[PDB]
Amino acid sequence: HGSLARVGKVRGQTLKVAKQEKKKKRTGRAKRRMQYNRRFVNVVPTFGKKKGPNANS
Amino acid sequence: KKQKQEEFKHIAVFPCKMKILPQYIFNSRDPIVMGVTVEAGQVKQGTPMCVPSKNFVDIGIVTSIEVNHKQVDVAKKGQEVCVKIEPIPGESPKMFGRHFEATDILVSKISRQSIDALKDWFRDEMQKSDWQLIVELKKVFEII
Amino acid sequence: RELVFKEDGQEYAQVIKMLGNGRLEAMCFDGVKRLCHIRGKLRKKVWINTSDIILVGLRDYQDNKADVILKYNADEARSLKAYGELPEHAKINETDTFG
RNA sequence: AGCAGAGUGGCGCAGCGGAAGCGUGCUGGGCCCAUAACCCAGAGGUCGAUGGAUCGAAACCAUCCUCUGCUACCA
RNA sequence: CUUUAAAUCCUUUAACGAGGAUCCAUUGGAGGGCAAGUCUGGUGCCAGCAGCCGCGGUAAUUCCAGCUCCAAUAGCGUAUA
């Protein structure tokens, strides 16, 4: 516990995990192409309700 | 510095330890005058006193100190003085034989604000023995 | 239940006035007064009376207003008195619960 | 250095002959969901101490002790 | 080479000038308003977030970090009239 008037306890106790190297993201005009493809081109007809683009349930 | 001295003189007191001499008692009441010998501490004119052994009774403050027909404001350790104690207005005056005797020990009525003002400002004028006496009076006066 | 000890930034306190608005004032061990504002987990479940030993944290940027942490029972208070973590000046003056 | 007033349960008071009470405070129980009121009880007294005029003294008388208020007299 | 008082820049034109084309795109946000995870770890009405409802009480779809995702895009957020 230590003290209550200390500031940044959560920031000073956060398990610092560095970012991992990833491939660069397409930007400008090609991102609109990939969004259009993934939202309107390779979609399957679905009944009920449509899941979101991040519904990892 | 002297302006702060004149400002803080009336609210900051010095530690004191007076032992009254037997048979050297020079008044009865209003003013309560006797000749006392400085056992410990340094006395300041205007300092109030209280007796610890008689359930914290206050008799008055100092108006004048006479050391063999000399007006000495501050007395050091081991010097025989004569003090002229005048009681506080409003309260009842005290006399000899029923509130205090010739065997009691007088100490200054010190206060928490006075130790705070001595430590904040008067530290350069404070001696270690008188600081020990201040700690003793803090242990005596129910001053937490 | 357990014997919690203090740490750097916290001290003990004794209640002088039990006051409203979720605040009170308690002395430290040397007599400096810190305005105690009670912790959010100690608002209704426990009750703090007058003249009892409590645990109060301090501030590392100012000295104007402090926060209460915990409270102790009477038996553990006199047990903590018997060890000698406080000087011989403070008296508990027989505070406990009635029957 | 001397005086005046007072001494009854923890606090205070009524108070004088055929007689230890009250107002407040403490403890237990009931009543209520609980508390404060309400009810039932209980505990707590060298009438400050001593001796005498006294069959009956807390009371009347004399001394002492304790607490509170007073005259001016000082290095 | 051109421009221009003299230049610079644009355009023309040499020789060089890329494959994780590292010659690497940020700013905000992810409960509702309002487009987009009941993902994984840490603190546990503390630290803090939040224009508004509110979120934090030792299983946080809102705090602090990693991955994914949403918005506009050389632009985006905030305070004021």
Curated annotation (Swiss-Prot), chain A:
The modification N6-succinyllysine is found at K49. It is found in: Cytoplasm; Nucleus. It comes from the Eukaryota. Component of the 40S subunit of the ribosome. Component of the 40S subunit of the ribosome. Contributes to the assembly and function of 40S ribosomal subunits. This is Small ribosomal subunit protein eS30. It comes from Oryctolagus cuniculus.
UniProtKB/Swiss-Prot annotation, chain C:
Residues 1-73 form the S1-like domain. Its main location: cytoplasm. The keyword RNA-binding applies. One of its GO terms (cellular component) is eukaryotic 43S preinitiation complex. One of its GO terms (molecular function) is translation initiation factor activity. It is found in: Cytoplasm. Keywords: Cytoplasm, Host-virus interaction, Initiation factor, Protein biosynthesis, RNA-binding, tRNA-binding. The keyword RNA-binding applies. Component of the 43S pre-initiation complex (43S PIC), which is composed of the 40S ribosomal subunit, EIF1, eIF1A (EIF1AX), eIF3 complex, EIF5 and eIF2-GTP-initiator tRNA complex (eIF2 ternary complex). Interacts with EIF5; this interaction contributes to the maintenance of EIF1 within the open 43S PIC. Interacts through its C-terminal domain (CTD) with the CTD of EIF5B; from the location of the start codon by the 43S complex until the formation of the 80S complex. (Microbial infection) Interacts with human respiratory syncytial virus (HRSV) nucleoprotein; this interaction recruits EIF1AX to the viral replication complex to facilitate viral genomic RNA synthesis and virus production. Belongs to the eIF-1A family. This is Eukaryotic translation initiation factor 1A, X-chromosomal. It comes from Homo sapiens (Human). The chain holds residues 24 to 122 of 144 of the full protein.
